[PDB]
Amino acid sequence: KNPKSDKFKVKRFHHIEFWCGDATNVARRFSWGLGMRFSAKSDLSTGNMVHASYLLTSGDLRFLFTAPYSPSLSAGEIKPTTTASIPSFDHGSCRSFFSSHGLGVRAVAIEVEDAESAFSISVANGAIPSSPPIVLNEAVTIAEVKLYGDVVLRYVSYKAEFLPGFERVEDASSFPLDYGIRRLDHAVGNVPELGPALTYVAGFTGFHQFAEFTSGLNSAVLASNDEMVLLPINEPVHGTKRKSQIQTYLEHNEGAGLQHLALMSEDIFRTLREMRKRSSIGGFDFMPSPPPTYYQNLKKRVGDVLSDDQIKECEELGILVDRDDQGTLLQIFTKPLGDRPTIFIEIIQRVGCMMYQSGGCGGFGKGNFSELFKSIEEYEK
Amino acid sequence: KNPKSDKFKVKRFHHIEFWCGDATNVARRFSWGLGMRFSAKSDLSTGNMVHASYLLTSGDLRFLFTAPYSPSLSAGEIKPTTTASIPSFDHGSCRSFFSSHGLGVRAVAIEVEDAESAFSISVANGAIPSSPPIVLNEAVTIAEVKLYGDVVLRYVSYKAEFLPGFERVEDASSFPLDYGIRRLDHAVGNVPELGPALTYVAGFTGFHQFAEFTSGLNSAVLASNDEMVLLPINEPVHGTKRKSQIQTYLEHNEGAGLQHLALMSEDIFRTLREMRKRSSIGGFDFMPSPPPTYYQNLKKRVGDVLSDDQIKECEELGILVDRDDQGTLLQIFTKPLGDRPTIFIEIIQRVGCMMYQSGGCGGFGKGNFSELFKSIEEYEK
Ligand SMILES: CCN1C(=O)[C@H](O)[C@@H](C(=O)c2ccc(Cl)c(OCc3ccccc3)c2Cl)[C@H]1C
Ligand SMILES: CCN1C(=O)[C@H](O)[C@@H](C(=O)c2ccc(Cl)c(OCc3ccccc3)c2Cl)[C@H]1C
Ligand SMILES: [Co+2]
Ligand SMILES: [Co+2]
C-alpha cells in the first residue's frame, strides 16, 4: 500500500554533500574512482573566503565535497556579509563533524517545490531545525532539518546552475569521465534506535513505509509519494554470535550517520569493469566476491531474467543478484570510502516494474543475506 | 666552501609525513597522481587503534599519510600500552595541526646513524624537543625536534621494513605504478623571519649555508656535510608592488610551514608526460607554462647541454631550465596539492657535477625568476 501522505511536494534526490578535511583530494579521488566529472566549484577563485566546495556529477547524480578554510580569511564577515555560497556552512560545525565522524555525508539533499514551505511544514510536524530557509540570488531556496546523528535533510527549490555563487569549471579541468552511474537510488542511515528514528522522520515528512526487515540488524525504508526518494534506516540487533556490523559502524562513527549511498547505473557491467580497473590505482575497492556456488545457485533463481552469459559476467565482476515478486536487483558494495569502517557505496541496477520504472523495483537485496550464507556453507563443503 | 660542520652523522632524507583528515583519500590521490606504490600500512587491520598511516614509495622517495581515528577507540590506552606505530603521534596535536594549517607536511624525516645521539646533540645545541627518542622493537629509534612552525625534523636510525608495526601491503592492493620519481631532493620552508630560522636550524644541526638569494622573498639553503640533505628556507619581502607569495602562504597556512617538496626524477620527460596525462583525472595540475619566448631564449642559454629536440620536449611539457657555473637544472611546479594555496610539489632533474652526482648540482632555479620575467615581457611584445 502507498497512502501517498507526503506533507509537502518532493521531487527527486538532488545532491549529497560530504564534509571533508581537504575537499580537493577527496573530490579528485572520487572523480577518478566513480567516473564523475568536475562540474562546478565555489572556492577562493570564485570569491568564497569561507569554504572550498567542489561538485562532481554523473548523469543526475551530484556529489558535493566541502571543507573549511582558515577562519581568519573571513574573520571580518558576518552572516549578512558572508562570502560563503552555502549559507548553512559553519567552520566550527564542519570541523566538529569531521573530528567526530571522519569523512562522511553531512547533507542528503532533496529537491522540493518550495524549500521554505517544506521547512515550515517539517518543523511544524516535529523536525528539528538545522538551518532556516535562505533565498540565494532570488533564485534558489535552501533549508535544512536534522535527519539522524549529525546528518541533515536539505531542501532545495528552484524558481526556474547548481547554486548561486558556484561557477562552472574550466573544461580543461573538466575531463568527461563517465562509467555509467546516473542517479542516487537510496541513502541508508545507521541509528541506535530504529523505532524513534522512523517515527521522527515519517512524522515530519509524511513519507510512508516501503519495506521492512527483521543478520545483526533491523531495517525499514521510508518513501516519498512516487517512491523515488528512498531512505532505509538500520539499527543494530544485539545478542547474535557475530557482532552487529551496525554496532561497529556506530562505534567507529561516534554515533548515528549515513551508512551507504546506492548509486544507480545504466550499465552495471560497464560501471564495475571501469571501477574495478581503477581499484588499485586510486579508485575504490570492492567487498570480497561471493563463492562460485553463489553463481551456480543464481541460474535457478534468476535464470528467466539473466542469460547464462549475463550470469557469467556477474560472476566475473562479483555482482550480487536478488529478486522479489516484482523485479530483479543487481548490486555490489565497495569497501569503506575512507579510513574508518563506516560509509561505503553500493552500485545498483534494477530490472522490471515498467509502466518509466517504478522506484525500489526489486527491493534492497535482503534475500542476499540468506543466499550469501547458504553459498558460504556450500563452498566450504 | 663546505666546512663539514654537521654535529652528528646524517645520511639521507628518509620520508615525508603528511598529517591528513582522511589518510586513505589523500594517499590514493597522491599514488595515482605521482606514480607511487602503496608499500606499507599501519591501521585497524594491523592492530593500530590510534591512527591510520599509509606509506607510498617511488624509488627511495617515501611519503607517509597519517590521520587519527576516533580517540574513543584507544581511550583505555596509555603511552606504555599504546597500539600506535608512531609513538610521537597525538590525536589532539594532529587535529590541531590540520585545523590550523590544512593538509600539509608534519615531519621531514632524515636517517641518521643514531637518533638518540642526534636528538641529544640537537637539544644540547638549541633545538626545541618535540618527541624524545623511542626505540621500536629494539630495531629502530625515532625522535623529533621542532624545525619551523608546526613542522618537525624527525630523526630515524636503524640497527640493521619501514617501521615496526607497519605491514607490507597485499600485492593485489599494491599496483606497481612508477612515473620515474626516485628521491627527495630538497624540502623548502616558509617562515616570517629568515635570520632567526637559519640561526636556529644551523645552530642545532651544524648544517652549513649552501646557497642564498636576495621577487618577493629572501632565501637561504642549509646543507648536510655531503650536501645531500638540503633545506631551503624563505621569508617574505614586504614593500614590492606585487604582494609577496610567501606572505600569502603564511596567511593561508596560519604561519610558517613547509612550502614545497622537490622530487628528483630519473627521467623528467617521462615523469611529466605521465603526470600531465592524469592532471584532470585525479592527479596534479601544473602551473602555467612559460611563453614560447622562454624556450627560444633557452637555446642561447643551454644549447650546449640540451639539443633542440630536448628543448622542444621541455616546451611540450612546460619544463623550466636553469644553469649555474657547475650544472644544469630541469624543474617544474605543480599547483597547490590541496584546498589552500600553500604546499606544492616541484619535479626536478639535475645534469652535471659528476665525480655520483654531487648534491644541489645546478642550484635551485633562482635564475628563472629573471628569465621568466624577461620572457613575460618579450611575449607581450
Ligand atoms: C536489510 C535492509 N537493507 C537496505 O535497505 C539496504 O539498502 C540494504 C543493502 O544495500 C544490502 C543488501 C544485501 C547485503 Cl549482503 C548488504 O551487505 C553488504 C555488505 C556486508 C559487509 C560490509 C559492506 C557491505 C547490504 Cl548493505 C540492506 C542493508
Ligand atoms: C629563491 C630560492 N629558492 C629555493 O631554494 C627553491 O627550491 C626555489 C624553487 O624551487 C623555485 C625556482 C624558480 C621559480 Cl620561478 C619558483 O617559483 C615557481 C612558482 C611560482 C608561483 C606558484 C608556485 C611555484 C620556485 Cl618555488 C627557490 C624558491
Ligand atoms: Co542498499
Ligand atoms: Co625548489
Curated annotation (Swiss-Prot), chains A, B:
Stored CDD domains: HPPD_C_like, HPPD_N_like
Domain VOC: residue ranges: 12-158, 183-335
A GO cellular-component term linked to this record: cytoplasm
Catalytic activity: 3-(4-hydroxyphenyl)pyruvate + O2 = homogentisate + CO2
Chain residues that bind Fe cation: 186, 260, 346
Superkingdom as given in the UniProt entry: Eukaryota
Cofactors (names): Fe cation
Sections of the chain in a coiled coil: none
Protein purpose: Catalyzes the conversion of 4-hydroxyphenylpyruvic acid to homogentisic acid, one of the steps in tyrosine catabolism.
Entry similarity comment: Belongs to the 4HPPD family.
Protein name, entry field: 4-hydroxyphenylpyruvate dioxygenase
Lineage: Eukaryota, Viridiplantae, Streptophyta, Embryophyta, Tracheophyta
